From TrEMBL:
<dbReference type="GO" id="GO:0043169">
    <property type="term" value="F:cation binding"/>
</dbReference>
<keyword id="KW-0750">Starch biosynthesis</keyword>
<dbReference type="GO" id="GO:0003844">
    <property type="term" value="F:1,4-alpha-glucan branching enzyme activity"/>
</dbReference>
<comment type="similarity">
    <text>Belongs to the glycosyl hydrolase 13 family. GlgB subfamily.</text>
</comment>
<feature type="active site" description="Nucleophile">
    <location>
        <position position="339"/>
    </location>
</feature>
<comment type="subunit">
    <text>Monomer.</text>
</comment>
<keyword id="KW-0808">Transferase</keyword>
<dbReference type="GO" id="GO:0004553">
    <property type="term" value="F:hydrolase activity, hydrolyzing O-glycosyl compounds"/>
</dbReference>
<dbReference type="GO" id="GO:0009501">
    <property type="term" value="C:amyloplast"/>
</dbReference>
<keyword id="KW-0035">Amyloplast</keyword>
<protein>
    <recommendedName>
        <fullName>1,4-alpha-glucan branching enzyme</fullName>
        <ecNumber>2.4.1.18</ecNumber>
    </recommendedName>
</protein>
<dbReference type="GO" id="GO:0019252">
    <property type="term" value="P:starch biosynthetic process"/>
</dbReference>
<feature type="domain" description="Glycosyl hydrolase family 13 catalytic">
    <location>
        <begin position="191"/>
        <end position="553"/>
    </location>
</feature>
<dbReference type="GO" id="GO:0005978">
    <property type="term" value="P:glycogen biosynthetic process"/>
</dbReference>
<comment type="pathway">
    <text>Glycan biosynthesis; starch biosynthesis.</text>
</comment>
<dbReference type="GO" id="GO:0005983">
    <property type="term" value="P:starch catabolic process"/>
</dbReference>
<feature type="active site" description="Proton donor">
    <location>
        <position position="394"/>
    </location>
</feature>
Length: 675
């Protein structure tokens, strides 16, 4: 009844044209939520699946449950029964759920902590098929033959071997300033670094640079390291190559001790096609109703060579929804990024598309209502468990109401990534001479967004040449030493890196993201150990020594990043709806804008200094430098006086006031009004 007028219609009048689609979508959501409440005691109860599935201790007994309707026989095997499951046969209920209850022996659990287990089943009268339980919380590999392969590990450490959280979740910041990181490649050494090494060495740097949030990639277990965490095998398992689940808790608690929020990459967009180690091992040709995945084309993602979930399946909803609670409750995360949302939103998965902005592309028979219902239930659940959670969507398409609350009719995400921004910088840096850069085009890319929804801006992210390397290339290996004066190319590259980051932050959105190393213009690119590079770890690491060495110039880019984040912390401009681009000067290559209380002046001209350049502002009074890219501490030339007063003159009777500034070439300066 109330689904006749969704709040989203008042927010965007164009949406009402697609009332039929939203009618269908919202009713599907309501129906599914009602089913969950009727049969499973609500979303909060339904998402406690990990206390029911996998291996769990109960009074005097151990219970193991596994959903496998396609099997006719099933047993639990492991080191505990010498890999013979004859005395540990499971029984199958009418819903295709297999169970076994194993009595304690002298009050001791039958399956020792840190011991290997497998789900053993037979289908169609064939040989035993042995898989890792779908709800396993840890899975290890032996670096001798295969890889790998992986072993499911019962993780239930005794009291003195458990990590106990000491610190509370910090509060939700006014704007997320996000440091995106991958633990494995976070060390200096050409090796897989560990959770504890990241916590102890990298977390302090993140805090020192004034980030308030960590986006932690590659946590969900993945057998293929080069997948960057995207191709998940064991959804409930902390990736073992960097340590144990207790090591991850240590990392999260340490982040919290430093006042940092932690979000985890949630990959619910697909599953690895790895048959031996992952969920795909449960597909034995059965109907989709009896699988994690669709069948035929709908079951396969061509681009990711991966399997695609049937989001309408009861057990798939239990699995995924419980997975969210698992990470949130057990590991104390402050939220998540859902990766591959674009693929989830459409049956074509947005592959090599192509989105025009026409609403017909968003609301049609290509819209995946199954997946949207799941994400709606997910967002309703997560924000109920943790009201201050931040949930980010990775969506390139620009789907309307993706980031409006479920109660409005939206999908329920808090932020989307501003995924169009990095493409603009790449094209400009690779293909366009500095003199042909359009100031309006830069502004368009940064500002052409949905203003009823929040976004996280970033100049570059993982996936290859960095902005700094596009700017400076081979010259970085010699030119970054302060032992000789900077060349014109080094001076240009350092200047523009700061400017590109700063305009992206200030104009691009309502939050900011930076990938590990890019804050100081880390050289080269990221390359994981693959077959095509002969399993090299050379570019699968971070050269912290570059930023730690005082006789290098990376410190200059790092200092600016620190100051930029500190500036946001002081003035709160990311969380301000006041955004006015007052000057786009194509001839002079100048952009002037206001964000919140700050007036920003960007001079992209290669060589020209503008004395007494008139810039518009809102409030009259006395202005001074708030942040100056040309300061010597940021490796600039020190041409802009920080103690210089800039008095305003009245305008009118398109800004009401103005002052005059000095603007040297390739500089960005933010000015504030003196109280």
């Amino acid at each position: 009844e109330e689904v006749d007028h969704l709040p989203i219609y008042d927010l965007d009048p164009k949406l009402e044209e697609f009332k039929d689609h939203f009618n269908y979508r919202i009713k599907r959501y309501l129906d599914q939520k009602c089913l969950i409440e009727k049969h499973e005691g609500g979303l909060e109860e339904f998402s406690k699946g990990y206390l029911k599935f996998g291996i769990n201790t109960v009074d005097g007994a151990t219970i193991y449950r596994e959903w496998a309707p396609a099997a006719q026989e099933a047993q639990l095997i492991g080191e505990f029964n010498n890999w013979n499951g004859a005395k540990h046969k499971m029984e199958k209920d009418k819903f295709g759920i297999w169970s076994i209850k194993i009595s304690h022996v002298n009050g001791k659990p039958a399956i020792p902590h840190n011991s290997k287990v497998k789900f053993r089943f037979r289908h169609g009268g064939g040989a035993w098929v042995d898989r890792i339980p779908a709800w396993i919380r840890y899975a290890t590999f032996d670096a001798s033959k295969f890889g790998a392969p992986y072993d499911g590990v019962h993780w239930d450490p005794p009291a003195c071997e458990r990590y106990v959280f000491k610190h509370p979740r910090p509060p939700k910041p006014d704007a997320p300033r996000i440091y995106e990181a991958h633990v494995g490649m976070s060390g200096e050494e050409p090796e897989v670094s560990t959770y504890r090494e990241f916590a102890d060495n990298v977390l302090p740097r993140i805090r020192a640079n004034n980030y308030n949030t960590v986006q932690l990639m590659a946590i969900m277990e993945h057998s293929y390291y080069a997948s960057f965490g995207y191709h998940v095998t064991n959804f409930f398992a902390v990736s073992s190559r960097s340590g144990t689940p207790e090591d991850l808790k240590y990392l999260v608690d340490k982040a919290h001790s430093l006042g940092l929020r932690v979000l985890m990459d949630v990959v619910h967009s697909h599953a690895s096609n790895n048959v031996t180690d992952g969920l795909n091992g449960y597909d034995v040709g059965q109907n989709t109703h009896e699988s994690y995945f669709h069948t035929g084309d709908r079951g396969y993602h061509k681009l990711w060579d991966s399997r695609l979930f049937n989001y309408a399946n009861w057990e798939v909803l239990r699995f995924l929804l419980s997975n969210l609670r698992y990470w949130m409750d057990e590991f104390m995360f402050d939220g998540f990024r859902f990766d591959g949302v674009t693929s989830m939103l459409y049956h074509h998965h947005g592959i090599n598309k192509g989105f025009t902005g026409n609403y017909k592309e968003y609301f049609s028979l290509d819209t995946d209502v199954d997946a949207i219902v799941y994400m709606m239930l997910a967002n309703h659940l997560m924000h109920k468990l943790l009201p201050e959670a931040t949930i980010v969507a990775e969506d390139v398409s620009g789907m309307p109401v993706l980031c409006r609350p479920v109660d409005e009719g939206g999908v329920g995400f808090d932020f989307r990534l501003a995924m169009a921004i990095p493409d603009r910088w790449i094209d400009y840096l690779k293909n366009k001479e500095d003199r042909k850069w359009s100031m309006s085009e830069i502004v368009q890319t940064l500002t052409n967004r949905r203003y009823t929804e929040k976004c996280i801006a970033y100049a570059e992210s993982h996936d290859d040449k960095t902005i700094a390397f596009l700017l400076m290339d081979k010259e970085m290996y010699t030119g970054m030493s302060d032992l000789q004066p900077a060349s014109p190319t080094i001076n240009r590259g350092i200047a523009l890196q700061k400017m590109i980051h700063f305009i992206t932050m200030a104009l691009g959105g309502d939050g900011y993201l930076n990938f590990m190393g890019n804050e100081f213009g880390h050289p080269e690119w990221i390359d994981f150990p693959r077959e095509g590079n002969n399993w090299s770890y050379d570019k699968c690491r971070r050269q912290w020594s570059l930023v730690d060495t005082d006789h290098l110039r990376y410190k200059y880019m790092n200092a600016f990043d620190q100051a930029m984040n500190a500036l946001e912390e002081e003035f709160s401009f990311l969380s301000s709806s006041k955004q006015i681009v007052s000057d786009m000067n194509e001839k002079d290559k100048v952009i002037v804008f206001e964000r919140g209380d700050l007036v920003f002046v960007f001079n992209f001209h290669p060589n020209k200094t503008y004395k007494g350049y008139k810039v518009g502002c809102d409030l009259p009074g006395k202005y001074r430098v708030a942040l100056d890219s040309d300061a010597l501490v940021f490796g600039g030339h020190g041409r802009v006086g920080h103690d210089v007063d800039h008095f305003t003159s009245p305008e009118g009777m398109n800004r009401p006031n103005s002052f005059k500034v000095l603007s040297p070439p390739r500089t960005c300066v933010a000015y504030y009004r003196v109280d």
